[PDB]
Design a protein around this ligand. Sequence first.
Ligand SMILES: [Zn+2]
Lengths: 76, 50, 209, 54, 99, 50, 149, 199
Amino acid sequence: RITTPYMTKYERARVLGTRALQIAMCAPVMVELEGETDPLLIAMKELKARKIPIIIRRYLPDGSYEDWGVDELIIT
Amino acid sequence: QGRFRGNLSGKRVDFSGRTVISPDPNLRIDEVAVPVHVAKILTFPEKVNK
Amino acid sequence: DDEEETYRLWKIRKTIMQLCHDRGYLVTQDELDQTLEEFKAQSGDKPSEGRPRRTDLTVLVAHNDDPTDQMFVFFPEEPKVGIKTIKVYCQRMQEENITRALIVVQQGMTPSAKQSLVDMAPKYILEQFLQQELLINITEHELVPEHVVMTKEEVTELLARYKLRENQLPRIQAGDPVARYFGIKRGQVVKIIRPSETAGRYITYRLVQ
Amino acid sequence: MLLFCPGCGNGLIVEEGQRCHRFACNTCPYVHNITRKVTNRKYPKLKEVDDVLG
Amino acid sequence: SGSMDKGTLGSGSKNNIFYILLRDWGQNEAADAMSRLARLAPVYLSNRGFSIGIGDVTPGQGLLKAKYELLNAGYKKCDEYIEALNTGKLQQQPGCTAE
Amino acid sequence: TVAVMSYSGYDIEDALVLNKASLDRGFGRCLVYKNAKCTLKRYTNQTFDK
Amino acid sequence: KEDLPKVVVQGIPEVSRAVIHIDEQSGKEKYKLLVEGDNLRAVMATHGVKGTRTTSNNTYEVEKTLGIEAARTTIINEIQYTMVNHGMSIDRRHVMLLSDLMTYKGEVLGITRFGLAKMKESVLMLASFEKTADHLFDAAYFGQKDSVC
Amino acid sequence: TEFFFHTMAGREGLVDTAVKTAETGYMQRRLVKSLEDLCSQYDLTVRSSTGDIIQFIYGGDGLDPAAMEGKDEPLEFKRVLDNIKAVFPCPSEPALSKNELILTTESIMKKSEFLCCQDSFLQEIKKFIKGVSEKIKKTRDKYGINDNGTTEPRVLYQLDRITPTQVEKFLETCRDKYMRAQMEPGSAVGALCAQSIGE
Ligand SMILES: [Zn+2]
């Protein structure tokens, strides 16, 4: 709860990459795509709709961690 | 040309091309024009999904 | 001579007073703010002034920590201090039961005397100081930021806030001029306040190692 | 200055004899006693009072 | 008010209109504005015409006269300085020799 | 016949615009000749490349 | 006669040349000393010199004389001045990070192979940068396990 | 002779660039090989690969050099205020005086979302607000503008016109820009510094 509430660009890139890799491997879609044959476009649509089922696990340098939902974080 | 500098830090990769550049203002700043000949050679593996 | 030498002596005495005030020892405001006229009143000539004895200081006590703790300042008259002078100073401190002493050399210290002073005794702490360095106060320099030695409680609070260890803090050598100016030992932490370009300040910390 | 023996042409050094300082050569018994004052000025260049620039 | 130039449309430093668009309304708006500029400016530049010729760099009569007078004055002053240094005493600038 | 002017923004940095009709009528037409050499040598044994 | 005129009678032996620079500010024209020497302590200790506002270009002398933080500040100021001299600007955070990396172990360590070896611990990077065989054989002798951090 | 001298100068420039290429290439290689280990952690502390801390906070404040709008400053308050006034001109709200501006600024700044912001930025915002309030006071004293809002020439209110809506918009925009200009954790700050020094 102490880190920045804004979702960084690295987190965005990694989440979009993981979601595109999953969707490319026959993952279920939660935004009801309309003729999008590119998995990255579907991942971006899910991110804009805030329906990505991925929780970022931010690790502190000492060893502590904290979980943040994609819908909980702030996007730009 | 050692292993560290020539084969570990910087190495050669496939699925790449090299071509001379020419101006084209009718394209967006985030877009780049690729020739048809190179496009037929550089392939992308797409997984079959629903 | 007899004009620049007394000025150097007065400035060295003022710098020593400032160093003792920064370390926490008891010095009155008159000793800190001492004009050249008062120093001339004490002694206005080089032969009248006594470097080995008339300038020695023994009233230096850590009033904040313990009045019983005593610190001494030496001013050897010879340019190069030998083993015999170090032994005389050590036996005098043994007589007066003083554990902390400073040696303000005039030109330098012989390597044998340096090695002996390094391993005199763990209880007898003696620091070598050149008069050339003491002619200017390091703290008053514009490049040198404000350094404050933190207590064990503050170091514990820092380590708890940042979830760090002692070895993970930035290092600073014991032979650093500021480190010898403050007389900090291995394991102590110093907070440094760097003046930023704006009205704010940057707080950093360094561990002596 | 640099002086040489008229006999053989080697360099002359300054030594002290039994009566007075004399020029002598290391390879011949030639000597020469000093009668009056002998001087050799060099006139080194005097550093000028450098101007204040800026 | 004002006319666009490198100080406002170039890649020199801040105060650029595209930089203001990027910092105020995001990346997409700046990209669209740059695309519209790159698609508009060449069309108008071609329809208006912009050419350089040998007559665009030729000197005028007043320019030639001024250049001749300035060359004469400079050569006379340089000859005076040469004569002052070679024959006589020349005012030596601080921090440097006479040469 | 070169005309120094800006046209269509396809000559931004050092580029030049060519005329299609000019290239169609032989302007700039070039020929590249390459050589392919082969050798049929006799070895130590009494056999030859055929 | 070969070395009698070459004896020092007054001044700092390390100091080779000092000039009187002047600032012609409209409020007042002030005088400062520009010394082409390698002894900052002696210059500060001299009479009539305001040692509180004396800087230098040699980072090693500043480190040895006024501490590691003064050395960091001198590095920052000198890098920024050298960059501004060419008309190109760099954000101060980059040079601050560089100075902090050079001055985080209490001693100014350079970017050369020696300073990089004194700062870094990874054997693979030390071998890849410079002195491959020497570093590899030294690591094999010490048996130093290298992580993948 | 002039052509020969010009060719000499051109060849001097050419050899200078030829030496500069290799020299800066080697310098860039060294700088990147030395600085590639540093990274910005999530606790706002720059640490090396072994875990040792290089800086408790990057640059002393923690702002992104790529998102630096001003001259080594996060925001240009004058341009931001002008943009807020231009984008959201409220014609149905009266102007604010010096006291009213200071009061609304102090009321808005004491909210919860401004607590997590750094103190230096808040002090700079207070300084800019005090400066613009002094400017408005000087204008109203020059032109005799009354704070009651009953002056006959209403065009006098158009000299320095400020409304609490514009104040809130300006403060929220400054807060959002300062929050979005901070160093995003995980960025390779060392490589960026090496490149921005070598180039
Ligand atoms: Zn002879």
